[PDB]
Structure 1
Amino acid sequence: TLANLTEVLFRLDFDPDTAVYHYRGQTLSRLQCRTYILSQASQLARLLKPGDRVVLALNDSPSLACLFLACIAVGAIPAVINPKSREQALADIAADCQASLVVREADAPSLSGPLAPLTLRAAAGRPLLDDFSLDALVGPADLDWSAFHRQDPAAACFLQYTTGAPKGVMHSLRNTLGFCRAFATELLALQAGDRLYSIPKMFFGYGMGNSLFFPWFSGASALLDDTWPSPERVLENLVAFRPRVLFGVPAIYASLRPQARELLSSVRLAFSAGSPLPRGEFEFWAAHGLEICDGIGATEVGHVFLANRPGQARADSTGLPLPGYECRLVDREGHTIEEAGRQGVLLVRGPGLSPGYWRASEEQQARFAGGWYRTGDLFERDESGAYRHCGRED
C-alpha cells in the first residue's frame, strides 16, 4: 500500500497532548508539531514537486525536525548535515543528491556552482518555530492541509550522508520503521512519556533516530540543543531536563565521570554507540549503579543493529543482534566463520537495512551485495553468541 512516513507517524496511537520535543526551556506537544508540520507542508508543496531533494544545514532544533518531516510530508527527500560544514563539503553533498533546496543558518552564504540549489535561511533569534522565510517566498500556509504524497514503502524518502566523495544512503518508510521497531521497541522498550537526551546531533544517523524519530515512534520526548555539546553544556542540560534515557558515546561517558551523581539522579538507561565502550568505562559506571549499554549501528543499516540488552550488558562486548537482524562473520576468502574466538568481517541484514546509495558506482554499491551490508568492521563471536569489535578490514 502506498504510504507516507510522516503520515504514518502522525497516526500512531499516542496522546497528542504529550511532549514530543524540548528546546530552550520550552516544550512542544505532538499536536503542536503536527499542526505546524502540516502548515509548513502546505508551503513546501508550493515550492517542491514530489521527489525533490533538500539539504538542511541546521543546528538541532524543533524547526529542523519538523521541517524534515514537512519535506517528507509533500514527498520531498531530505538530508540533515552538519550546519558548520565547510562550503565545499556542503556543495559536494548538494551536488550528489541534486538538491533543489538548501536550508541554512542565519547569515550563511548562498550556494553556487552548476545547478546550485535555492538557499533559504533560518530566522535570527532561535525561535521555537521557524518559517525559514517561507511566509515571504510562497505566502502564508493553508489552514487544514493533508495532501500527503504517498509512495511505495520501499522507495527512498530521506537520505543520510555519513572523507571521500560523499555518498547518500537511501532510507525508506519500510526500513525506517524497521530500525525504530527493533531498537526503540524491542531492545529499549521505550515508554510513552520517557524523556530522551541524545548528545550526538541529528546530522549523525545515531542522533536522527534518537532525537527525531523515537519521540514520534514511541510517544517519548527528546531534548534538542542547537549549541555544541561541551561537558559544561551537557551537564546544565542534564540538570534542567533530567532525562530518563541518555544516548552517548564512550568519550562522553568518560567526560561525565566527575558528574556521576547528577547523571544518576535521572538517567536509568545509558546507551553508548559510535565506538567500542572500554571495559574501564563500563565498570566505573557499574560501580555507581549505572549500566552502560554498548551497541553498534551504521548509516547503511538505519540505527543500532547489534547491542547489549538492558539489564544483561557485559563489559568489552557489543552484545547480540537485535531482533530481526542477522549477523555473519566472513573470513578473508568470503567463507562464513562458525567458530567462536575467530575474527572476520561483520555482515548484517534485517529491518533497518538501506536499499542502497542514492548515487554510486557499482563498486560502491557492492557494499550491499547479496542482501547484506559489509560493515568493514572485524568482529569475533564468543560461546554465548555475543560479538566483540576487533578492528577494521584491510
Structure 2
Amino acid sequence: STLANLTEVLFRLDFDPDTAVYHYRGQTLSRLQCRTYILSQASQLARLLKPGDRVVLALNDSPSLACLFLACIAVGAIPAVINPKSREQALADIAADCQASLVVREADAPSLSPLTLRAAAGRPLLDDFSLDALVGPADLDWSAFHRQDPAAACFLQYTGAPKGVMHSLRNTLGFCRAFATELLALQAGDRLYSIPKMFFGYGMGNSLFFPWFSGASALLDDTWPSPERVLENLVAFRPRVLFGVPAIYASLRPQARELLSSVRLAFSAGSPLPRGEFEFWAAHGLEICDGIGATEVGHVFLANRPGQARADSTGLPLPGYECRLVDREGHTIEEAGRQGVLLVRGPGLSPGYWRASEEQQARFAGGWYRTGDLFERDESGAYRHCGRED
C-alpha cells in the first residue's frame, strides 16, 4: 500500500481548522491551535525517540494528553495511555511489557526503576512536559511525519498480566468510520462528552479520535467524574452526544431534566444496559443506544442503531463487521436462542497483541476475535448478552 501516518491523515481531513476540537477547564482549542502545537511538540519528541519506540502516558484527560499522544504518532512512536493512578508495580509492569522508552506521568510522581517525565503543576491548557528544558524549544515548521504501512502497529491499548492491543492506521480509521460515521452519523460542530477516560479504549475513540475524524469537539476533564462534577460539566458544556455506561445513566436519574436539556444522542457501553434503565429514560423521552466494544476490536462493533433501539438488547453488527456464535466444540451456531461465544471480524479488528504467548494470541485465531462473551441471537438477528464463558 501507500505509507501513511495516522496523525497526518487526521490533519488532512477537510474540516474548518478554525472550529473547536477540544474543551478543557472552560477554555477551547481549535483544530489549528492543536495541529500547530502537535507539530511543534513532534519536533521535540523526534530528538528523543526513534520510530517504533514505545511511550506510556499515565495521564488524566486533557488537551495536552491528546496532543502528546498524536505527537508521538507523528514521529513514528508507539504511545499507550493508561490509568494515571496506576500503582507503581502496575505501571512498571506495563512499561516492561512494551519495553517503553519514555513514561510521562503527573507531577511529583516517583521514578520508574525508563526515562520518566512529569506534567506541570497548575494544569495548564498546553503542557510541554519538561521537553523545553530537556531537548530545547520546538521547531517552528515541523512536518517530518514518519510514514509506515497502514497495517503496522501505530499505538497500543492496554486492557491477569496486562495485554497490549496493537492498533494500526487502517483498523483505526476502520472503527472510526463504522461507529462515528455509519452508526452515529456525527456531524461537524457536535459537542461530545465522554465520561470514561482516554485510558479506556471506549474513551480514547470518544474523546481523542472522533473530534478529528468527524469535525466534532470533545470536553476533556482531568478530575474524576463524581456525579456532582458530571453535573457541572453537563450544565457548563451542554453536550449533544453523551458517552456513558449503565451505572452512569443510573446515577443521572435525579438529574434527568438537566440531561434532556442538551443531550440528543446517549450511548452506553462497557456492560449490558438493563431494561429498567432503558425504560426509565425512554419514558423521559431519551433513547439510550446499547453497544458492545472491545479493545481488541478498536471500538463498538455491535450496537443498537439510533432511533431503532430495543430494551435488553445489544443490537446488530455494525456495517462491515461480521459476528458469529460458536458452540463448545468451536462449531458455528446457526440457530436462534442458542447462546454461544461471540466471534467478531471487521474494520476495527486489531492485528494482534504486542507481546503475548501463543495461548493469548489464540484469541485472534482464524481472523476473528474471540470475545469470551456468551451471546444469543433472536429471530430478528438482534444479539443479547448472556454472560462470560468458563
TM-score range, shorter chain: over 0.9
* CA-based RMSD: 0.5
SS in 1 for 2:109: coil
**1:152-231 pair list within 5 angstroms:** 152-161=149-158, 164-231=160-227
Instruction: Give, in whole Å, the separation in 1 of the partners of 2:284 and 2:15.
Output: 34
Per-residue CA distance 1:305-339 (angstroms, 9 max, x = gap): 00000000000000000000000000111111111
Task: Give the CA deviation at 1:21.
Answer: 0.1
Percent of matched pairs sharing the same residue: 100
SS in 2 for 1:323: coil
Task: Give the CA deviation at 1:55.
Answer: 0.2
Task: Give the CA deviation at 1:7.
Answer: 0.1
Instruction: Give, in whole Å, the separation in 2 of the partners of 1:136 and 1:157.
Output: 28
Task: Give the CA deviation at 1:239.
Answer: 0.1
Instruction: Give, in whole Å, the separation in 2 of the partners of 1:25 and 1:97.
Output: 36
Per-residue CA distance 1:57-115 (angstroms, 9 max, x = gap): 00100000000000000000000000000000000000000000000000010000xxx
Task: Give the CA deviation at 1:236.
Answer: 0.5
SS in 2 for 1:90: helix
The equivalent residue for 1:65 is 66
The equivalent residue for 2:271 is 275
SS in 2 for 1:159: strand
* Deviation >3 Å, runs of 4+: none
SS in 1 for 2:353: coil
Per-residue CA distance 1:323-366 (angstroms, 9 max, x = gap): 00000000111111111111000000000000000001111000
SS in 1 for 2:352: coil
Instruction: Give, in whole Å, the separation in 1 of the partners of 2:110 and 2:171.
Output: 35
Which of 134, 139, 145 is equivalent to 1:148? 145
Per-residue CA distance 1:115-170 (angstroms, 9 max, x = gap): xx100000010000000000000000000000000000000010000x91111000
Instruction: Give, in whole Å, the separation in 1 of the partners of 2:161 and 2:257.
Output: 44
The equivalent residue for 2:130 is 133
The equivalent residue for 1:48 is 49
Per-residue CA distance 1:165-215 (angstroms, 9 max, x = gap): 111000000000000000000000000000000000000000000000000
TM-score, length of structure 2 as denominator length:
0.99
Instruction: Give, in whole Å, the separation in 1 of the partners of 2:161 and 2:340.
Output: 27
SS in 2 for 1:49: coil
The equivalent residue for 1:320 is 316
Per-residue CA distance 1:209-245 (angstroms, 9 max, x = gap): 0000000000000000000001000011000000000
Instruction: Give, in whole Å, the separation in 2 of the partners of 1:166 and 1:326.
Output: 27
Per-residue CA distance 1:14-41 (angstroms, 9 max, x = gap): 0000000000000000000000000000
SS in 1 for 2:16: coil
**1:261-272 pair list within 5 angstroms:** 261-272=257-268
Instruction: Give, in whole Å, the separation in 2 of the partners of 1:145 and 1:333.
Output: 55
Instruction: Give, in whole Å, the separation in 2 of the partners of 1:176 and 1:364.
Output: 22
Instruction: Give, in whole Å, the separation in 1 of the partners of 2:228 and 2:375.
Output: 35
Instruction: Give, in whole Å, the separation in 1 of the partners of 2:92 and 2:284.
Output: 46
Instruction: Give, in whole Å, the separation in 2 of the partners of 1:123 and 1:236.
Output: 25
Instruction: Give, in whole Å, the separation in 2 of the partners of 1:50 and 1:35.
Output: 21
Instruction: Give, in whole Å, the separation in 1 of the partners of 2:379 and 2:256.
Output: 34
Instruction: Give, in whole Å, the separation in 1 of the partners of 2:23 and 2:342.
Output: 37
Is 1:241 matched up with 2:237?
A: yes
Instruction: Give, in whole Å, the separation in 2 of the partners of 1:351 and 1:299.
Output: 13
Instruction: Give, in whole Å, the separation in 2 of the partners of 1:310 and 1:31.
Output: 32
Instruction: Give, in whole Å, the separation in 2 of the partners of 1:318 and 1:239.
Output: 30
Instruction: Give, in whole Å, the separation in 2 of the partners of 1:360 and 1:392.
Output: 22
Is 1:291 matched up with 2:292?
A: no
Is 1:6 matched up with 2:7?
A: yes
TM-score, length of structure 1 as denominator length:
0.98
- Structure 2: segments with no counterpart, 5+ residues: none
- Structure 1: segments with no counterpart, 5+ residues: none
Is 1:124 matched up with 2:121?
A: yes
Instruction: Give, in whole Å, the separation in 2 of the partners of 1:266 and 1:98.
Output: 44
State the number of aligned residues: 389
SS in 1 for 2:252: helix
